[PDB]
Amino acid sequence: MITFIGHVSKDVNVVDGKREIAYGGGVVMGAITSSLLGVKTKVITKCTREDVSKFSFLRDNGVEVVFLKSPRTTSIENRYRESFLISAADPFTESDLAFIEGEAVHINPLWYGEFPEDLIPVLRRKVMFLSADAQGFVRVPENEKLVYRDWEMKEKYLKYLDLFKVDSREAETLTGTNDLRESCRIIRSFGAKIILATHASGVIVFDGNFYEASFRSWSLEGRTGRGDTCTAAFLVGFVFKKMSIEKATKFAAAVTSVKMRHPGPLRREDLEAISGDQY
Ligand SMILES: O[C@H]1[C@H](O)[C@@H](O)[C@H](O)[C@@H](O)[C@H]1O
């Protein structure tokens, strides 16, 4: 089993000045992927009681969800890649981790402060395989605008993580370099045992050696949730299906590719468009 911990979000997507609402967040995209890939999946999240029915579809995709109490629901405005934290559910606290079970937990936050760094060592004691998304540690609200800032305590906390996920913009923020491979080498030197890096054309996994796989389909409206889908697929392949790291990398790319053909989370039919020849 895998547990995803993170805020759900009312996304306000603004396309050429047109507002369109989507009910998402990183945990939605990742949890649906792992569940549809056949791994028992749990989500620990927060939102208002009134908004719980917006996220009921997690359960229809096989995901067990703990909807913890919050007086607000996270809402992020995305302008088209500029995002703003309009409203914020309450952060996670230590006691929210009390029931943690299963082999794997992915720390999947939308904004720095959602998942206080103090929770990292606490959670480490409870789980065999612990991963986190850099978005939760570098994307910082500043008069709402989510700005990219270096994660000051990265060298303290990266040693706690079996896997660390970044995308291009995160990796550059952490390292000063837009060379993605080199940033992987730098982030490894900070304590990261395995780094999963997504970028426009594909995914790079680095554990001392590089493994790469390219995406083979895409759409503009399907690109949101790329990285969360890819992370969840990699965790499924590597942690639960016992694929080699090279094979899990190709698998993660393959699953992400088919999800990117449409808006919203992975769909079961997407999996039929993968060939086993790929990975
Ligand atoms: O990865 C994206 C990104 O964090 C967006 O800014 C957020 O609004 C979406 O919920 C998330 O899925």
Author numbering: 1 to 80, 87 to 285
Give the article text.
Here, we identify a PPi-dependent kinase belonging to the ribokinase family, which is distinct from the families of the previously reported PPi-dependent kinases. This analysis demonstrated that TM0415 utilizes PPi but neither ATP nor ADP to generate myo-inositol monophosphate. In general, the overall structure of the ribokinase family enzymes is divided into two domains: the phosphate-acceptor-binding domain (the N-terminal half) and the donor-binding domain (the C-terminal half).
We thus also determined the SO42–-complex structure, which possesses only the sulfate ions and myo-inositol in both molecules in an asymmetric unit. The sulfate ion is well superimposed on the distal phosphoryl group of PCP in a protein molecule that crystallographically corresponds to the PCP-bound chain described above. The contribution of R229 to the reaction was confirmed by the fact that an R229A mutant exhibited only 7% of the level of the wild-type activity.
